Design a binder for this molecule. Structure first.
Ligand SMILES: NC(=O)C1=CN([C@@H]2O[C@H](COP(=O)(O)OP(=O)(O)OC[C@H]3O[C@H](n4cnc5c(N)ncnc54)[C@H](O)[C@@H]3O)[C@H](O)[C@@H]2O)C=CC1
Ligand SMILES: O=C(O)Cc1c[nH]c2ccccc12
Lengths: 495, 495, 495, 495
């Protein structure tokens, strides 16, 4: 296992690709323009990254359409797409240390998180979706003796995948795993905040046997190359993870253009509900802390509203505070670090503005509240807890996307449910109770795509993942993620 | 069987409800405004129908939300919803002769059509959907021993259904069936061109045991109450059948509103591909004629592009022409009538303007081509055929929505596919051939939601129905229709 | 509601068919032999029932094969079979009062039982099975592009169903429902102890539109016509509910015959596990009493082993005892009667001999324990409880098939499972506890086909039913029941 | 690629294990007895193989029961059983040349068949079933709001797998892949004719991470160790592939003992039906030859009745004869050989007795008929064709299990169907036609588990495989094979 010094040497010794990837080749943007990729770790210049626009989009869509029409991947045998997808995942694992290090330098998460959560997680999404292609079965209808009716699925065609920066490789693999498996071509627009891992893996896909043009990568700004894709006339489906504001704008784009399919995964204000009869109080405290502190609160499913029953609130809130103190911001290149940098100064000041709004709304600060380690030139905020929060307050309604917990109270399960669902979101939620009926009945009433019971951030590749309401449409991971990339056909045959 | 005279008297003795239906009662629009419901049969004024606006949408959606939250329907046991759903169908079949009379009078299709296709059709969508409720199963994932991972479906909440006028009852039941069966509340916006059946079955649902507020009906204009419903912020899902141009608009409204779910059934330019080696040319010719004549050619899955292998086109065309002669417009209240009125003056002049375009385009008119029965006080076009159409032509590329055939020819099976897929649409297509290989391979390359082989207008309630590309997203009929009215939840339980 | 007097007259005025049913007509056995059908209510002679033998099996199976091969049923469209199947159910509900009277008179269960459980129960198995026919889908495999791989189901052919006497109509419908719905032909051998309902619904099926020969009924003895059917070489599948000792025999016959398929529903010694922390002790006590009293304890899923946490056994037992007092044998033709006659003199002396064994075994009798109502001319045992039973005891290990409770105690949840799984059986079990973890983990370790939690006699038509180990193979009810009446075919088509 | 001399050197240099494997260790039979393993290639002594009996069975079942109860594999996480199963398959591929060579020396098939069909095929069955564990989902019922009903599958417990000698490693992997995946313990009784590969892989499983006792291997005679397993009281399910005679006797064993589950895969007389409109006549001829010649006719799905339409029979039968001549018996250690030895002299003389019976029945010999290469001390029979065969004849009814083709005629498809189904078997069948309707309609009418169209021996791991009628119960390969190793449980929970 590598020391801190070991990692800082590796970061020095990287040659970092910054070019786009189109038709099996790395390429500049047609303008030749670039944008600067700056690390949140120290502030250094990682690379000069190609800044793509509509022309670069049009080139990539033509490469996607061409490759798809050729059938070189979309009609390649399903046992062979399995093999190739599994090889693709293993090449992520082969160069895990390079890819993890790129992910830490690019958006600022702890190297030990990247090495042990992100890169394994993205490979997992690829290899699992690969294992599943030939385990899937389409349907025959019950038809009269002179009819045979097939209901089959086929690749939609060309998929645009616009992903965010909080889990750059993992989120993109969550889109690529199912989309690439079902035979589609994918044009992949990573975040401007985190272009480095999507850029590197394009060569890795080619080397695994993905045919040229089946996976092109277009780094650049959302309002440029991203808009262009969402607005393109030859793009069939767009998949997306990011701000509820942009997801909504994507829908408009689709209706303004070719009426493409739009699948969104937007934000969340996920309630974490601890009941007085929780089986292990310490586990819930540890989990409540981990729910807001992990990946410096830049998590869509962050447990950002802690919902406690009064009977235990006085005993519980110190337990949470003590757990949350084990989560200390640090040098993201240090393997012992578990809280990293916020992605950029912009993210840092939104977080600090919300903390202020916590005071202004009337809540009470009980831990954190400050930016630390500014001597580094990095951007870090200590995890922060607010108490006496009321669900109408700005820090209970609006997604903060930082390590900032709100704590509310309730007396009955009917109340807890009502407060948990008093949000435009529905991405995740948690229930802690040892009572069988209360456990299941509360899971039913929670309008959230993911409901964890006696644990937080649960699920593996078998669990679908996505939101209710303004939190998204569709589900990533699992067999259901495939449905966003396929189209049902009814072949009815007279005999 | 009832005679012409019989229906003429029955029509005269109908008493027609025109009101909207909210919270278990008939009602006016808040404004008190109405619009004249005019029958294309002879100008007869059927009734003065409520002209609802945004104020009424808000009343209805408030009603829906209360009903849904109360659980009277949404948490009523599956098997009980099933029985209710089947009774609902039963009441359609009980009032079949009135409902069919309303259909024919409001939008001008033949009464024998209405009695024999629409009412049984919409009834079955209600009953088959109810039959399947308790036959469904949600999933249990392969988890480690200390986990229980449930993957379940829940109703989204309140569903807005905006439905077209070509099949007023049945198109609505395609939505009501699954949407009501999954336990949602529905606000149903019928066509201003055809409100009568939707208005009517509202009472019928109450009587079947549907609770007040679970199904509310709002007659009125697309650009008033229809646009308000898709812009409403407490409407979780919108489902829509109709024009591609308006379907695009709903995607935009959703983006502008609450990021609600948007399922679209839109336009169509479906190809009918007849190979020389087709088993029965007579059968292919009668069905080619039926494919464009039935329901006045106002069918989204109409076979408006007839693609013929040149090697038989000199022989096949007269068989199509002669077959089409048996489809003759007449009194829609005559049981003998197989072609009815067009829906209004507006619709007739689109059809007539496109026939004019055909001559402009360079096409040869070989059958029909005129407006008929001007004496009636009603709107009628003869089934019309254009020969020598080139796929780039206007009457080939654009949907006409009347009895207008475009006849194209092809030298290879590959040419047949290029031409078939050379459209922004993908609702349906058909393939006539007795070759086992040619049939299935051609079916695969057709980017259409429904592919009929050696038949036209194939499938029953077990076959999904919907488009590729700009013809829509999602499927009506079958078990897949249920997906557009539910939301997936992953309940991961640590043990 | 009909009165005691009412049923007494109705019974007296019944005219009872006793004949067998082959090829659409009632008939005698070839021999002309009959056997006396004697009512356990008072010795009354209901009718002289056809005593069929191998000659009749061959006639019936010849009939079945012709019907099946003709296709009148086996290749009739799914949706048409569905309607027929539902009408069949309809005719059971139409003649519910006669059918129930027959059930109660033939095998001596309370008329309120028959009217309210058996007839609706068997009716629903017929209707729910018919409802699901067209809701099923067969599969399409992920193949290379030049292949089409269908995976479909077809009816096996002619099914022999030999059914027990504890639930004569419903147990038969559990087989008829799916077996008829998948389109097989059935030869149904009711119990010699209870032929009347099976004989009767044969007419009813003809009238529902079941073709002649598709359902044939052969009353008679297990060791004559029953053994012949399972030994017959044109019978593709045999399905059987009844004794473990006879179920073993059918496996042997199949080996000796045509290697036909053998699906078994057999014996039971199901455990009822009551933890101290159960939510409602009253609810657990009433249901423990119901679990052994209902239907005279002649239930395979009867809760004959009541496993109690010692920490509540001194408190819980009187609640079970007192509850059991409300179950009192009486006139089975009295609507007030909740415990009926035992099925015959033979059955009564097994129950009485096992009660004697209980005293021999070392158990303490705390309730009941006697034969009752000797004056009636009929066979009755009081619901009986033994306390201090050790799991090795005879009355613990062997099925008694009467109202006889054995009460055991346990110190740990692990002990509760050891004792529960310490039996050759695995039909059912239940677990009372309010702990979320204890409930689900205990449910997993119970090697039983049905596990009921915080309730007894759980499930509806959607839940599979059948044993682990020597209680059987395969499942009745749900969609899985259909698997025992179909055969899978892989049609791989090269293109 | 290895030469013939290269392989004969390797066969000299093998140390060959002949011991049983029980509880992670190789072990003698409790008697110390052995039997001689003699190669059909030259006649040499391969090893002295442990001859197991009931005591060795009892030891192995205790090891299986113990390992299963410990949960060390049956409750190990499904993603980890996937990993282990895939590692197990890769160790087959790592030592493919040793394992293929053992398979060729032990039962006499061509080394190039073993290396390229058998060993890849068995690894494929293991790795595929491994990939599929966490792609499988159990079910939640549609239940009232106060009920949650799970339908889950669990490992049956202890599985006995008795496999034949025609594909020793592949057939055993077809049982092991699904049985080991679902968590069961497997006791594996290979053929006495082919013990070597099952013996070797036991170490390979241990080395892949299969826990000790989860896979024990018991070589020895069917009437000894095999009978004992089938008769054992603590064996839950028996799976089997072999003679219809023994399969039937296994059923008797199960009923004589513990009423265990019995899954059988017995013989076949598979019709290969070539129609005059077959798309490629030469392909059908080549396939018809390959259908009987491949693996020297020792194939259950061997195309042993060629069904030809008269119109082409005179043109077709020479084409088959010419193809069949390219299939020449040879030294099984030669890589160019494609027909090997019959397994033993006993097999050789059954084949020769049937060839004689061909003449006696009245058929006419047109190719082969003789034993050749006796100078070798090996046992070889040249592929043989009989013409003018009638379905009543002994070589058209009785399975030969040699390279012996029967050829019959027909004039209509109704006739062909009738002759194809005029058999007690139903394992496979083939249809050759370019006509769409005839292709599908004939596949429907064929009572066979596998129906190939325009190809023979089709299917991959996605296609189930098993028989109708006396040809077996259940299906190997695909997701359905898992059902023989699991048990359904209905967990119904009141809330
Ligand atoms: N198409 C198919 O599925 C196959 C059919 N066969 C048929 O079987 C013969 C050749 O193969 P065999 O191995 O002799 O079939 P078989 O049924 O005699 O042998 C199958 C396996 O069980 C056997 N066995 C025999 N008696 C047993 C008993 N009393 N209890 C338990 N197991 C017992 C053997 O030990 C072997 O491991 C014929 O030549 C024939 O064609 C054989 C293999 C495959
Ligand atoms: O079971 C058999 O008799 C052999 C067999 C079935 N399917 C096969 C595919 C490839 C090679 C051999 C077989």
């Amino acid at each position: 296992t590598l020391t801190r010094a070991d990692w800082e040497q590796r970061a020095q010794n990287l040659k970092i690709e910054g070019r786009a990837f189109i038709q099996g080749e790395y390429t500049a943007a047609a303008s030749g323009e670039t944008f600067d990729c700056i690390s949140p770790v120290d502030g250094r210049l990682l690379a000069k990254v190609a800044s793509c626009d509509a022309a670069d989009a049009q080139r990539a869509v033509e490469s996607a359409r061409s490759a798809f029409d050729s059938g070189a991947w979309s009609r390649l045998a399903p046992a062979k797409r399995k093999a190739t997808m599994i090889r693709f995942a293993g090449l992520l694992e082969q160069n895990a240390e390079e890819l993890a290090l790129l992910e830490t330098l690019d958006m600022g998460k702890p190297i030990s998180d990247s090495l042990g959560v992100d890169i394994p997680g993205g490979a997992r999404a690829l290899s699992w979706s690969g294992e599943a292609i030939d385990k899937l079965y389409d349907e025959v209808a019950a038809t009269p003796h002179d009819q045979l009716g097939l209901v089959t699925r086929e690749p939609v065609g060309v998929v645009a995948a616009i992903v965010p920066w909080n889990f750059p490789l993992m989120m993109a693999c969550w889109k690529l795993g199912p989309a690439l498996s079902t035979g589609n071509s994918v044009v992949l627009k990573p975040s401007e905040k985190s272009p480095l891992t999507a850029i590197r893996i394009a060569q890795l896909a080619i080397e695994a046997g993905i045919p040229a043009g089946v996976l092109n990568v277009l780094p650049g700004y959302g309002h440029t190359v991203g808009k262009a894709l969402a607005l393109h006339m030859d793009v069939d489906t767009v998949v997306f993870t990011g701000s509820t504001k942009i997801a909504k704008q994507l829908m408009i784009y689709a209706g303004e253009s070719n009426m493409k399919r739009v699948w969104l995964e937007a934000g969340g204000k996920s309630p974490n509900i601890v009941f007085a009869d929780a089986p292990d109080l310490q586990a819930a405290a540890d989990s409540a802390a981990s729910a807001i502190a992990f990946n410096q609160g830049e998590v869509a499913t962050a447990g950002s509203r802690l919902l406690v029953e009064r009977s235990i609130k006085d005993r519980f809130l110190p337990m949470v505070i003590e757990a949350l103190g084990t989560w200390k911001p640090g040098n993201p290149l240090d393997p012992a670090t578990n809280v990293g940098a916020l992605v950029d100064t912009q993210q840092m000041n939104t977080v600090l503005s919300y903390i202020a709004a916590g005071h202004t709304d009337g809540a009470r600060l009980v831990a954190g509240g400050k930016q630390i380690l500014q001597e580094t030139g990095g951007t870090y905020v200590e995890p922060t807890i607010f108490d006496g929060v009321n669900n109408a307050m700005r820090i209970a309604q609006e997604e903060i996307f930082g390590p900032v917990l709100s704590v509310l109270t309730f007396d009955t399960a009917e109340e807890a449910i009502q407060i948990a669902n008093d949000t435009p979101y529905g991405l995740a939620a948690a229930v802690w109770t040892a009572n069988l009926s209360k456990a299941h009945l509360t899971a039913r009433a929670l309008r959230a795509g993911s409901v964890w019971v006696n644990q937080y951030d649960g699920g593996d590749m078998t669990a679908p993942f996505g939101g209710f309401k303004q939190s998204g449409n569709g589900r990533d991971k699992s067999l259901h993620a495939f449905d966003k990339y396929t189209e049902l056909k009814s072949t009815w045959i007279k005999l």
